[model samples]
Target: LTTHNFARKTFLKLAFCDICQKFLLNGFRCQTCGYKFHEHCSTKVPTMCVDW
Candidate 1:
């Protein structure tokens, strides 16, 4: 069970892809922003990803 709202989750929870904008079951979130994103997005275009 997961909450669709990203903001309600803990820092490590997978909410959505910041780059793709889709619901994700597995993703990465940097504590600084608490926004979750796909591994592909986090690594594929880190400069762009972190910029958001």
Candidate 2:
């Protein structure tokens, strides 16, 4: 017989704008991965729009 144990750690969700790399408060995330970024950052970089 074999036993396995698993533990989870508490972590806070933080999003960095792909453009400015600044912490974002309110923004959208990718549906596939939940990757988030600030709206301003979106506009600065690759030009992406996300709905939160």
Candidate 3:
């Protein structure tokens, strides 16, 4: 075996689901609108909504 490598950093993005209005553990965020949604809700979003 070898020595340990770099430590894994924690990325905590706390947000609520727009659809169900519940706490979302894992989800995706719309870059443009900055909207957060759960994995299931993300499907209906229909677009990436990406903007500069």
Candidate 4:
């Protein structure tokens, strides 16, 4: 079972990919603006698989 502290930690790290508007796994953060997204979302071109 997940604990309150664990839930809070997970929420803080949560990120949505700009491309698909889905939750990102182990999300990536932009260096310039500190924006967050999935690694695939940061790509200039579409990839074969965006799902984890």
Candidate 5:
């Protein structure tokens, strides 16, 4: 199974979080899958890749 490799990212504009489903100003984004998550919410991120 594939897992998300989340990396810290800065949001210059509004972005939505995949884990918390909330709008974010800055957060984490998966370098492997391009999934976005809130800073604290990335810890709870799921393993499924939405693009694959």
Candidate 6:
């Protein structure tokens, strides 16, 4: 199984965070699983995922 690897990237566009359900202008995104989270919310993201 692969972990939900997230990376910090610039978001010039609007993106809703999957963890906090808020707008993320700058946050983390897993290019591998399409998961999004805010810098503060990334630590609390769910471990469940369908991508490996």
Model 2, TM vs. native: 0.37
Which portions of model 1 show Cα errors greater than 4 Å? 1-14, 46-52
lDDT against the true structure, per candidate, is: 0.50, 0.45, 0.51, 0.45, 0.64, 0.69
Per-residue lDDT tens digits for candidate 2, residues 1-52, read: 1222112222266556565656655555454434555555444544333332
Model 3 pairs whose backbones collide: none
Local lDDT at 12 for model 3: 78
**Per-residue accuracy of model 6 over 1-52 as CA lDDT, tens digit each:** 7777677886667888756656776667777777777766665555555564
**Tens-digit per-residue lDDT, 1-52, candidate 5:** 4666666777667778655656865567767866677656644545456556
- What TM-scores do the predictions have? 0.44, 0.37, 0.47, 0.39, 0.55, 0.64
CA lDDT for candidate 2: 0.45
In terms of TM-score, which candidate is strongest?
A: 6
What CA RMSD would you report for each candidate? Answer: 9.6, 13.3, 11.2, 12.2, 2.9, 2.3
Model 5's lDDT to the true fold?
Answer: 0.64
| Candidate 2 backbone clash number | 0
TM-score sort, best first? 6, 5, 3, 1, 4, 2
Q: Between the candidate structures 3 and 6, which one is better when assessed by TM-score?
A: 6
TM-score for candidate 6, please give it. Answer: 0.64
Worst lDDT window (10 residues) for model 4? Answer: 1-10
Candidate 6, pairs of clashing residues: none
List residue ranges in candidate 3 displaced over 4 A.
1-13, 46-52
Q: Which residue window of length 10 is worst by lDDT in model 6?
A: 43-52
Which stretches in model 4 have alpha-carbon errors above 4 Å? Answer: 1-13, 45-52
